[PDB]
Design a protein around this ligand. Structure first.
Ligand code: SXL
Ligand code: ZN
Length: 260
């Protein structure tokens, strides 16, 4: 209730370390993925994305981004395999995007920034609940998917059209029966490394799995994202753009590739 961090000039990523010292930690995210240095790991098991039974419930503008929330009271939508040991349950997805197509993603590929990045957040069921999971090194698994501007993503339109109803901070809307499988690219080839949440509290509890294949969304679709507001209703308009944290030092970590 007393957090004041954001993405503006005076409360942006370069200021976060004051209230959250872990911002300068040993396994912070996002990071630049240097494709020539990432090594193929033949030991990585196949990635398993089982979203057939996913049950979305609501979409919320939290003043930073918008979250599409799922019912995670049961083992429906889960992520397993890949670098993961155990079962991770989908709790929500959100995006990070820019003010222009040339920036917006958190992770970068050989320093290339994509227009946006989708994050599907999952928590390790061995810890019982999300709050307990974020206190563990292997508590979360976040699946990251890059977005580039070109052809429209049919599966994203239902999200785009509901944004008018959650323009400002604190607004939410019913959002049932949304199928996240419609946001995935064809290939599940990925890079993986141990990291953190990319907004405060910046906890170092995430196994990052970033897909190599980006999805394409249309200019009209991303333009709608850019019409959202960071501010609450009745306050001066601050367009919700550039809600991404820049790449952090890789330090003592190796990024592994699931493909050759
Ligand atoms: C506390 C928490 C709960 C949750 O369901 O999702 C989150 C997502 C993020 C993130 F958006 F910053 S990221 N990018 O690290 O996923 C940060 C914190 C949470
Ligand atoms: Zn995120």
């Amino acid at each position: 209730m007393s957090h004041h961090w954001g993405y503006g000039k005076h409360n942006g990523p370069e200021h976060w370390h004051k209230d959250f010292p872990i911002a300068k930690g040993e396994r912070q995210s996002p990071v630049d993925i240097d494709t020539h240095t990432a090594k193929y790991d033949p030991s990585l098991k196949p990635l398993s994305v089982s979203y057939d039974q996913a049950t979305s419930l609501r979409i919320l503008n939290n003043g930073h981004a918008f979250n599409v929330e799922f019912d995670d009271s049961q083992d429906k939508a889960v992520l397993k395999g890949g670098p993961l040991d155990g079962t991770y349950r989908l709790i929500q997805f959100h995006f990070h995007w820019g003010s222009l197509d040339g920036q917006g993603s958190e992770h970068t590929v050989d320093k290339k920034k994509y227009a946006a990045e989708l994050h599907l957040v999952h928590w390790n069921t061995k810890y019982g609940d999300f709050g307990k999971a974020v206190q563990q090194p292997d508590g979360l698994a976040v699946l990251g998917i890059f977005l580039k501007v070109g052809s429209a993503k049919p599966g994203l339109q239902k999200v785009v059209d509901v944004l008018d109803s959650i323009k400002t901070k604190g607004k939410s809307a019913d959002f049932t029966n949304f199928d996240p499988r419609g946001l995935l690219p064809e290939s599940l080839d990925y890079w993986t490394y141990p990291g953190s949440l990319t907004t405060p509290p910046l906890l170092e509890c995430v196994t990052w799995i970033v897909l190599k294949e980006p999805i394409s969304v249309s200019s009209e679709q991303v333009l709608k994202f850019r019409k959202l507001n960071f501010n609450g209703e009745g306050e001066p308009e601050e367009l919700m753009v550039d809600n991404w944290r820049p790449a952090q030092p890789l330090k003592n970590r190796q990024i592994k590739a699931s493909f050759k």
